[PDB]
């Protein structure tokens, strides 16, 4: 029969390709990921719930049937012309610039977007919005005072590992609110101001999040196939990759913030 | 453990044919390239006869030769990519089933069609060339046709009709009785019966003459990168035709 | 491009002939029971045996026909011709019909010639004596077809009765069932041997059901000759055959008619 499997020795090139932390501004800095086929459920779940049970809180099964499910991912590109392919190096670095950017961006849309369980995001990929997941809100006028209240309702067991996410439109704010109350020098060193690790700032996020993203947002990717084809009318190729992904949430450790 | 699991397990997938054409049972079937046949085989033995009939007009209208004319079509498989790589299914026979089933019901479509869809006109029995005879009941209409059929064609006649029409006539031949529940359909008309759903209205004729030719085939493979699919296409050309129109008549209410 | 060679032939079915073939276009049902011979000149006696003195007078009929016809029976040659026509284009399109299409055609022509003459309603002149409906057979009268057949058996001599056979059209065998419907019971599933008590054969030409001992009826083919020729101008080959036969009834008093 004609079909040939992708050589396994070529696969691990793509395993480290799908998962990468090199980029500046993503939740990939803080969340957990992997590439292992064998794992079937969040590995640490048992150590979590009992420690939560030490407190009055314990888990509601917000995710049904913890065992993962296989959701599909797809990529497509068109190189401009064989002249790019006539050479070697600029080709190879061009592709890796693309995929990482596309893969990383795509999971990010599913989580943070205001698309909120409809519209552009496929209805197949439609539960996983955090707004749609059922986190409880915190509110306050002062954003500085606001998130102290929210870091501190967290269970004190996992308070040591927590990280805040923020929009640049929010970033410009607090440094203003600080200056009026002083601590201008302290401002610009957010990690010191609020004891936290890995503070993050981006622009796709619309509202402020807090919580231990190390244990909550476990995920895994696995490649399947990499295809290649010539197209003769144009000078172009048709490169593409398709893979499988899936992801989970533990909303109790997380808290959203909403200032007025 | 794996022994305590049952051991009728298969490791492999198969399937029955998805669809098939009933007219292959009785019709002629060929492979010949550029085929020709004569219309009438034995001409009349004696000087004097009365057997001259509209068949004679039919042969006068068109030559004694029979021309089989190529006609194109195509079939697709349309499997995906995940099925291949995400598991060891070994479905290589499955696609083979869909393809040779593909060409099959193509015949069943155009040979039995209400709208002949220009280019496919001369092959459907409902084109209008064949006659129509009428009866009060479906049972009466079928036997009324058999009276029309000349002695050459009556002796090896054959009927095609939908099974639901055999069920209504036997009920009225009955009287609210479940005594016909095993009657072979041959015994009530006196000729072989064959059943398919597509035949709205019955037909009847000899079916030595309805002939088929597959001239050539071509098979190839490719990929569709955007959707991941492999196509596994097949294309070929065939013709079908009725040697004479006094052979194949129509019943009706 | 090398050519139109491909692997589709495997996908193509297995019932494909690769050359032409067809069925017997017509047949003679009467060949089952009647005798069949190839002898040049044929002569037989009509009366098989006569018993001792205590013979009740031979049936009035046999006294008459035997007296008129004489003890022997003459099988007298009679001619006909069978034809076959193949245009020239059909030859030169790579098909083999020379071998099988003609034998299928000519052999059938022999059969239809017989059955046409035997069951002729109004025979051609010069061949009246062959038919069973020319005359000289007695037509009994039953109220219906069921009564007429059984009465006709009641008429002829018992020796012929014991060996008798019926020929009729199948549609008439349906009508006798409708009167023997008897409500619940259905003789569509029954054979026809058991209704009348003797064998039956079905044939569409036989109008009025005939009956008798078809031991006596006989046929003979003496000689043949096979020929072929081309009509050069019109461009059609020809294949012609001829032969001489005759068939007669050893004793007319046997075979009788049924009529409503």
How close B199 gets to chain C, by Cα (Å)? 24
- Are residues C15 and B24, on separate chains, in Cβ contact within 8 Å? yes
Decide if B167 contacts B178 (C-beta within 8 A).
no
Q: Structure tokens of A257? A: 């913030």
Q: What is the 3-state secondary structure (H, E, C) of B16-45?
A: CCCCCCHHHCCCCCECCCCCCCCCCCCCCC
Q: At what angle do helices A89-112 and A8-18 cross, to 10 degrees?
A: 50
- Checking DSSP bridges between strand B203-205 and strand B72-75, what pairing results, if any? unpaired
**Contact residues on chain B for A11, CB-CB shorter than 8 A:** none
* Residue where the block lists tokens 């302290």: A186
Q: Is the Cβ–Cβ distance between C210 and C132 less than 8 Å?
A: yes
C201 part of contact set with chain B, CB < 8 Å: no
Q: Are B157 and B146 in contact (CB under 8 A)?
A: yes
State the virtual CA torsion across C4, C7, C10, C14 in degrees, nearest 10: 10
CA geometry: angle C126, C130, C135, nearest 5 deg: 95
Edge-first strand listing for the sheet containing A240-247: A71-74, A240-247, A219-227
For B90, left (φ over 0), alpha (ψ -120 to 50), or beta? left
Distances in whole angstroms, Cα of residue B240 to Cα of each of B113, C18, C95: 14, 16, 17
Interatomic CA distance for residues A201 and B102, integer angstroms: 58
C-alpha C84/C-alpha C106 separation (Å) is 7
Resolution (A): 4.0
Cβ B81–A242 below 8 Å, yes or no?
yes
Alpha helices in C60-201 (DSSP H): 60-69, 88-91, 101-118, 145-155, 158-162, 170-179, 193-196
Residue C156 · residue C252 · CB < 8 Å = no
| Chains near C (3 or more Cβ pairs under 8 Å) | B
The partner residue sitting opposite A227, judged by closest CB among B82, B86, B223, is: B223
Tokens of C54: 């205590």
Q: DSSP letters along chain A, please? A: ----PPPHHHHHHHHHHHS---SSSSGGGTS-----SS--S-TTHHHHHHHHHHSS------SSSSS---EEEE--B--S-HHHHHSSHHHHHHHHHHHHHHHHHHHHHHHH-TT-SSTTS-GGG-S--STTTTPPEEEESSHHHHHHHHHHSS-TTSTTS-EEE-BHHHHHHHHHHHHHHS-TTTTT-HHHHTT-SS---BSS--SEEEE-HHHHS-EEEEEEEEE--B-SSSS-B-BEEEEEEEE---GGGEEEEEE-
- In angstroms, the Cα distances linking C14 to A226, B24, B30, B102, B232 are 39, 12, 10, 16, 21
- Would you call A207 exposed, middle or buried from its count of C-beta atoms within 10 A (0-12, 13-18, 19+)? middle
A61 Cβ partners below 8 Å, 6+ apart? Answer: none
CB-nearest to A229 from B85, B221, B225 is B225
- 3-class secondary-structure state, position B117: coil
| Residues after which chain C is discontinuous, using a C–N cutoff of 2.5 Å | none
**First and final C-alpha spacing in chain B:** 66
**Burial of B150 per CB tally in 10 Å (0-12, 13-18, 19+):** middle
What sign does the dihedral A52-A58-A60-A61 (CA atoms) show?
positive
SS3 at position B122? helix
Q: Chain B neighbours among C 116-135 (CB < 8 Å)?
A: 124
Backbone φ/ψ region at B132: left (φ over 0), alpha (ψ -120 to 50), beta: beta
Alpha helices in B86-162 (DSSP H): 92-111, 138-148, 151-154
C-alpha A113, offset from chain centre: 12
Contact B41, C112 (CB under 8 A): no
Alpha carbons within 13 angstroms on the beta-carbon side of residue C112 total: 24
Instruction: List the single best residue of B85, B219, B227, B230 to mutate versus A (max A Cβ within 10 A).
Output: B85
* Coil, strand or helix at B248: strand
Encoding tokens for residue B120?
A: 């496919």
Chosen from B19, B22, B32 to mutate, greatest number of chain C CBs within 10 A: B32
Question: Closest-CA residue in chain A for B221?
Answer: A2
Q: What is the largest CA-CA distance in chain A?
A: 74
Work out whether strand C218-231 and strand C35-37 pair parallel, antiparallel, or are unpaired: parallel
What is the rounded CA–CA span in Å between residue A239 and residue A233? 16
Residue identified by tokens 């008309």 is: B189
Q: How many Cβ atoms sit within 10 Å of the Cβ of residue A256? A: 19
SS3 state of residue C228: strand
């Amino acid at each position: 029969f004609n079909i040939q499997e992708l050589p396994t020795a070529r696969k691990e090139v793509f395993k480290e390709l799908l998962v990468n932390r090199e980029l500046p501004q993503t939740l990939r800095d803080v969340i957990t990921i992997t590439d292992d086929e064998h794992v079937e459920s969040i590995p640490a779940l048992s150590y979590i719930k009992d420690k939560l049970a030490t407190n009055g809180i314990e888990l509601s099964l917000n995710g049904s049937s913890k065992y993962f499910d296989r959701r599909e991912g797809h990529i497509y590109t068109e190189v401009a012309d064989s002249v790019v392919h006539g050479s070697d190096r600029t080709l190879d670095d061009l592709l890796k610039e693309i995929f990482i950017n596309e893969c990383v961006s795509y999971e990010t849309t599913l989580l943070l977007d205001k698309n909120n369980a409809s519209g552009l995001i496929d209805k197949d990929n439609q539960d996983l919005s955090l707004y749609n997941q059922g986190i409880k809100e915190v509110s306050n006028t002062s954003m500085y005072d606001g998130i102290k209240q929210a870091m501190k309702d967290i269970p004190q067991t996992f308070r040591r590992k927590v990280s805040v996410v923020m929009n640049t439109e929010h970033h410009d704010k607090l440094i203003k609110e600080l200056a009026q109350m002083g601590l201008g020098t302290l401002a610009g060193d957010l990690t010191k101001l609020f004891n936290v690790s890995h503070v993050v700032v981006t622009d796709d996020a619309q509202d402020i999040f807090v919580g231990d993203f190390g244990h909550a947002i476990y995920a895994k990717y696995e490649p399947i196939m990499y295809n290649k084809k010539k197209q003769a009318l144009k000078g172009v190729y048709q490169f593409a990759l398709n893979y499988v992904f899936d992801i989970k949430i533990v909303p109790e450790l997380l808290r959203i913030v909403k200032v007025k | 453990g794996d022994k305590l699991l049952p051991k009728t397990l298969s490791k492999e997938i198969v399937s029955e044919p998805f669809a098939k054409n009933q007219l292959r049972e009785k019709a002629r079937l060929t492979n010949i390239k550029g085929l020709e046949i004569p219309r009438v085989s034995y001409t009349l033995d004696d000087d004097d006869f009365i057997t001259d009939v509209e068949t004679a007009k039919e042969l006068k209208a068109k030559g004694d030769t029979v021309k089989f004319t190529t006609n194109k079509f195509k079939v697709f498989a349309a499997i995906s990519d995940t099925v291949i790589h995400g598991s060891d299914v070994d479905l290589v026979n499955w696609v083979e089933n869909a393809l040779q089933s593909g060409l099959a019901a193509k015949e069943r479509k155009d040979a039995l069609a209400v709208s002949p869809k220009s280019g496919l006109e001369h092959m459907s029995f409902y084109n209008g060339s064949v006659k129509e005879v009428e009866g009060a009941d479906m049972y009466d209409a079928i036997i009324n046709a058999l009276a029309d059929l000349h002695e050459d064609y009556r002796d090896n006649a054959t009927i095609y009709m939908r099974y639901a029409d055999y069920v209504k006539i036997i009920s009225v031949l009955s009287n609210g009785t479940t005594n016909f529940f095993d009657t072979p359909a041959e015994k009530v008309f006196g000729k072989p019966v064959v059943f398919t759903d597509a035949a709205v209205k019955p037909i009847v004729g000899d079916f030595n003459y309805f002939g088929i030719n597959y001239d050539g085939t071509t098979y190839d493979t490719d990929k569709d990168v955007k959707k991941g699919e492999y196509l596994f296409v097949l294309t070929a050309w065939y013709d079908q035709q009725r040697t004479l129109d006094s052979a194949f008549r129509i019943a009706k209410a």
